[PDB]
Amino acid sequence: VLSLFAPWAKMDERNFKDQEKEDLVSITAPKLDDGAREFEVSSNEAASPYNAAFQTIFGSYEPGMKTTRELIDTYRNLMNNYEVDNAVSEIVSDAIVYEDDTEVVALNLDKSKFSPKIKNMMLDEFSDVLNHLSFQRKGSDHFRRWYVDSRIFFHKIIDPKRPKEGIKELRRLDPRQVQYVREIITETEAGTKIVKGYKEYFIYDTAHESYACDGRMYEAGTKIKIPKAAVVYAHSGLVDCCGKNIIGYLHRAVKPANQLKLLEDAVVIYRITRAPDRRVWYVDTGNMPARKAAEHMQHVMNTMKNRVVYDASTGKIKNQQHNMSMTEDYWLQRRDGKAVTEVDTLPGADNTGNMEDIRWFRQALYMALRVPLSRISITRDELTFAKFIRELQHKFEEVFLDPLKTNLLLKGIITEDEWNDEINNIKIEFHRDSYFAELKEAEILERRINMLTMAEPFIGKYISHRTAMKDILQMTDEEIEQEAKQIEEESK
Amino acid sequence: VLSLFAPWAKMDERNFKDQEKEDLVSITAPKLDDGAREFEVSSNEAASPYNAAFQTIFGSYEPGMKTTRELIDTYRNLMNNYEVDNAVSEIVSDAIVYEDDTEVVALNLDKSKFSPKIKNMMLDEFSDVLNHLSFQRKGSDHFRRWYVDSRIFFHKIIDPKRPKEGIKELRRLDPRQVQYVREIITETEAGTKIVKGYKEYFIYDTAHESYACDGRMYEAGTKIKIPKAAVVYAHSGLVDCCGKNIIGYLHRAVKPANQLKLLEDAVVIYRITRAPDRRVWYVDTGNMPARKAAEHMQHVMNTMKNRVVYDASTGKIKNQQHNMSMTEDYWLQRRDGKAVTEVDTLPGADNTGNMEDIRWFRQALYMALRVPLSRISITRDELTFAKFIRELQHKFEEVFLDPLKTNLLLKGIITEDEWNDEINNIKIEFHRDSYFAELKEAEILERRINMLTMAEPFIGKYISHRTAMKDILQMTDEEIEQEAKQIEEESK
Amino acid sequence: RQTGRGEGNFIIASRNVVNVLASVDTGISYAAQGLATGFSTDTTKSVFAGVLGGKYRVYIDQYAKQDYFTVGYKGPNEMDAGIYYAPYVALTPLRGSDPKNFQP
Amino acid sequence: LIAFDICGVQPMNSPTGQVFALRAVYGKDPVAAGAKEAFHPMYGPDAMFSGQ
Amino acid sequence: LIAFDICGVQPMNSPTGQVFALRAVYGKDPVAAGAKEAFHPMYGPDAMFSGQ
């Protein structure tokens, strides 16, 4: 494709080949769990370079990506509405946590290390990974975009002449312009059951030449093929009823979010219309040609029309005198002894509701936005919510594992085998709201003390002190010995 | 008859031969309550390995999967619907609990074992199985799909040239891409009861030919017969009123989920339609051929139409200026004295609710999702729910126990006979949230402490200290003696 | 070529054809024949004789009037069949009696 | 018996049913003498049609 | 369809490409009737060219 990606191709081609070397065969369905859109291809003997690409590019490009565009557009439109904005804010706030002079996302390398100093190298790289996002200042925004859009992608930079020192700051890719694909690179007797290596690369789309609310978009119109190694990315493990139609967390609320604002708007238009007085004059203009017939109607209007309008700039009636009528005296000069020329009034903006149904709908929406029921101590709802946030962080986390292994491998700090054994678990942790974290511990302590207090009369009779520490205070034995030793020291 | 699966074909055939040597004969029964579809074959047909192709073709005209597809597609949408989705989330959350510096479901071999070396190997193998499934990261997703779909399947991988060592990671098979079948290999003098081993194999399929929203472009073409032994699977003990139709946990919601949706939308439509002002103008255009009559109508409606629009992006009225009239004064005319020209005003989506029905149905629905009524201390409802969660866990778990058996057996660590003797009980224990566990135990202890305290005045007169320790504190004899030993030493 | 959907995948033929198929080495080989073992020839037990080369489903036409075979194609779908049978009503029993003489 | 081993069925839910079929047809008017099927399996495609 | 790997492709990023060939020649004049290609497989070497 382009030599521009040569260092990545080297990484991607090797990974592909190593995967092919494993006979993961006799597998009917392609070995795909989630993510990328596969395009079945076939090959003569082993591969059909650029033949497959023609068929793949056109076969996947034409019938596709419309859905992706719509989902993103929808999610942004959703985000821009009242209380969605807040729900997103709350998630982002809880998900990306930092405070004055405290911890930030951090690489907790507490597991076995190579010698063991590799940890210093990894920690230094980690700091740069954050610097390459400017996470410490923009982390909230990167997260929000991922959460809201369901996905995020960044281009990785290689020197490329001296690639070991070449990793630079990341380049975010436009939403709706990324197609993640896989190829089923095999065909054989009765349908391929041959190792499915796929390559797993991306297609960079360009030229979103359409429109959006109050604007137009522009780009190149080219389709660029990339192996995978070149891009840092993440996406939610959320798929709609069909295929690999990847959706966001915001997807679930699209329905009710819109019907709710629709109901609110319906109430508003209901209240607005009919608010001013309304009435039609009926006029008998018969036995005349239209040329003259119109005079009866035109006359009544010209002299008796209520030409008065409300001043909404200043609370007054526009330039009227005297200050206010006691009655509106109207009259008609009847052409005959018949009630044919008259005024027929219409109903006003009556207080029909009971504008309460809307309360059910809003309640339902708040919840639907993935927020605690209590938002408009310790509870199951909070614990549940916190677990959700933690999982969002885990999904997002790849953004710091990917560029990390990338430069460690590009530079010559870590080998592929070492990465594979370290992780496993090199989990990047995050800070949690300190107020609530301390509160949680405080509540725990109070309960533990109350239990100890009640237990107390028998701590020297039925339950030992060590046992009480282990069951009442939920202490480990090492913890118990440490507490006893510190007490002994203090006692002297 | 694909040689590609020979390692498992061999396992199934050996099992079958062992069944042939069993005397569990003279059985009218299909020998199955919940499982594979029933078909019959002659023994001479069955004798050929290609009988599978033949039976597959028969089964193709009684598709099986078509029904399961309709059920699953329904289940997928129920999961997708708000106030269904969340119940599933809570269930999944409790079924598989994750925490920092905490274990995950693990194999607890505290029961009789053939050997401590095997024990060590099995524990490591169990871990490799979880690693193969990426359980530590995706265990809850696999579970969710299982709960909703009623089942999960996985394709096993064997080298197969070194099928002791080349044991590779599972490929999740999506329900609707697979069916479980069983054949009667026998005939007799009207009513065969001859040993029916059945083999119980699987058939692979897939189809995106039918309607899809997106992301679906594949079809199995021919179907593939897979040895039973080649598939890891689990399913809930939930079946239909007939046959072997496997039912998901959300099947209960099929009725009320949609009843609620139906009512909700009806309420919304009711409220929106007829919310804004609606009115009909009438013009007396009589004594004209029709096209001519319209001129009179146009002479009125082109002046009467209130060509004003409500801006829902910004709450404004388009073409309103000046700010707002005190009244809407219209003039309508007629060519005779006949009160025919007029304007009608129309309803009026009145605030009739009494929005109580939708609420009753929502509560009923929510309960139907197998959740506590306390959801939107420790109670019977919570305990009942926990029992439910364990029931789910103990069916799901086949997903780990099956490959555990297979891998150990292939390696040459265990024999099948040994497997059958050890299990019995090689229970894998699931992690449960320690927060709630602590609360439960603490409450239990509080009550036990209070009982002890109250008993105290006659603990040395009518009942003993031992009595209280075993009856109130619910200690075992060993527990009492050991606890005392520790107390006595602490007292020194 | 004729259907555009797929090659023949089944054979229905005179027992004699089958006797030949079952007695010849159907694989790619030098030359060979012997007693029939390759396919069932016994219409007592089935119609389905076996699969030729693992490729075509072979059946016995027990009523061939002379000696012939038919080869054909059936796809995975119901539309790709050539021949259709939409039963709509089938084998529905009637039970009762005629009370005039009350016989079943 | 092997009555349906090679037969499509799609059992009807009414007597006297129907089936539809579609041919891709070139030459402007789909209904014409000499009209030709774009993907006819036996007859070859016309390469001049989209070209010279 | 038949794969296009039965032939070369050289897809282009522009219309109208060109191909250059380097034909080794002999007989003191690159452009002449009778001039010959040094490595044309149909013909043997001119066995006496540098010789008799």
CA R_g for chain E: 18
Q: Which two tokens stand for residue A419?
A: 């990465």
Q: Which of C18, C61, C78 to mutate to test the interface with D (most CBs of D within 10 A)?
A: C78
| Residue A129: strand, helix, or coil | helix
Query: Residue A173 has what DSSP assignment?
Result: P
Query: Do β-strands B37-41 and B202-204 pair in parallel, antiparallel, or remain unpaired?
Result: unpaired
Query: Residue A128 has what DSSP assignment?
Result: H
- Whole-angstrom CA distances from B475 to A477, B137, B178, B471, B483 are 21, 39, 51, 7, 10
| Residue A307: strand, helix, or coil | coil
Q: Which two tokens stand for residue A427?
A: 């989990």
Helices (H), A27-79: 51-61, 66-79
Residue type, B412: G
Residue type, B151: R
User: Count of residues for chain B?
Assistant: 492
| Residue B107 burial class via C-beta count within 10 angstroms: exposed 0-12, middle 13-18, buried 19 and up | buried
Question: Given a contact as 3+ CB pairs under 8 Å, which chains touch D?
Answer: B, C
Residue found under tokens 């839910």: D13
Contacts 24+ apart (CB under 8 A), B164-167: B164/B410, B164/B411, B164/B412, B165/B411, B166/A23, B167/B407, B167/B410, B167/B411
**Per-residue buried b or exposed e for E5-38, using 16+ beta carbons within 10 Å of the residue's own CB:** beeeeeeeeeeeeeeeeeeebeeeeeeeeeeeee
- Residue B327 pairs in a beta bridge with A277
Q: Which of A2, A50, A187, A223 to mutate to test the interface with E (most CBs of E within 10 A)?
A: A50
Cis check: omega of the bond before A160, within 30 degrees of 0:
yes
Is A48 within 8 Å of chain E by CB?
A: yes
Q: How far is E13 from chain A (nearest CA, A)?
A: 11
Is B50 within 8 Å of chain D by CB?
A: no
Under 8 Å between Cβ of B409 and B416? yes
Distance, CA of A155 to CA of A233 (rounded, Å): 9
Question: Count of H helices and E strands in chain C?
Answer: 1, 4
Q: Taking CB atoms and an 8 Å limit, are A44 and E3 in contact across chains?
A: yes
Distance, CA of B301 to CA of B279 (rounded, Å): 12
CA nearest to D6 within chain B: B57
Query: Do β-strands A106-107 and A428-429 pair in parallel, antiparallel, or remain unpaired?
Result: antiparallel
Distance, CA of C67 to CA of C51 (rounded, Å): 20
Distance, CA of B334 to CA of B340 (rounded, Å): 8
Of the candidates C2, C84, C88, the beta carbon closest to that of D42 is on C2
Q: Which two tokens stand for residue B168?
A: 């590779």
Q: Taking CB atoms and an 8 Å limit, are A474 and B359 in contact across chains?
A: no
CA nearest to B42 within chain C: C45
Query: Which residues on A lie below 8 Å from B267 (Cβ)?
Result: 357
Half-sphere exposure (Cβ direction) of A243: Cα atoms closer than 13 Å:
21
- Whole-angstrom CA distances from A186 to A34, A192, A394, C5 are 20, 6, 34, 22
Cis check: omega of the bond before B155, within 30 degrees of 0:
no
Distance, CA of B4 to CA of B350 (rounded, Å): 69
- Residue A343 pairs in a beta bridge with A281
Residue among C39, C45, C44 at smallest CA distance from C17 = C39
Of the candidates C45, C50, C77, the beta carbon closest to that of B50 is on C50
Under 8 Å between Cβ of A286 and B341? no
- Contacts of A365 by beta carbon, 8 Å cutoff, 6+ apart: A83, A253, A256, A257, A260
Residue found under tokens 């529905």: C92
CA R_g for chain B: 35
| Residue A408: strand, helix, or coil | helix
Q: Taking CB atoms and an 8 Å limit, are B486 and A464 in contact across chains?
A: yes
List phi, psi (to 5°) of B12. Answer: -65, -40
CA nearest to B60 within chain D: D5
> Considering only residues 6 to 45 of chain E, which have any Cβ-Cβ distance to chain A shorter than 8 Å?
9, 11
| Residue A144: strand, helix, or coil | helix
CA nearest to A52 within chain E: E3
Q: Taking CB atoms and an 8 Å limit, are A285 and B323 in contact across chains?
A: no
- Residue B79's CB is within 10 A of a number of other CB atoms, namely 21
- Whole-angstrom CA distances from A472 to A10, A453, A463, A476, B410 are 58, 10, 10, 11, 47
Distance, CA of A107 to CA of A130 (rounded, Å): 11
Q: Which two tokens stand for residue B425?
A: 């009980």
Distance, CA of C59 to CA of A261 (rounded, Å): 66
Distance, CA of B287 to CA of B293 (rounded, Å): 8
Residue found under tokens 């995020």: A152
**Per-residue buried b or exposed e for B238-259, using 16+ beta carbons within 10 Å of the residue's own CB:** bbeeeebebbbbbbbbbebbeb
User: Count of residues for chain A?
Assistant: 492
Q: Taking CB atoms and an 8 Å limit, are C88 and D6 in contact across chains?
A: no
Measured over all CA atoms, what is the biggest interatomic distance in chain C, rounded to whole angstroms?
Answer: 75
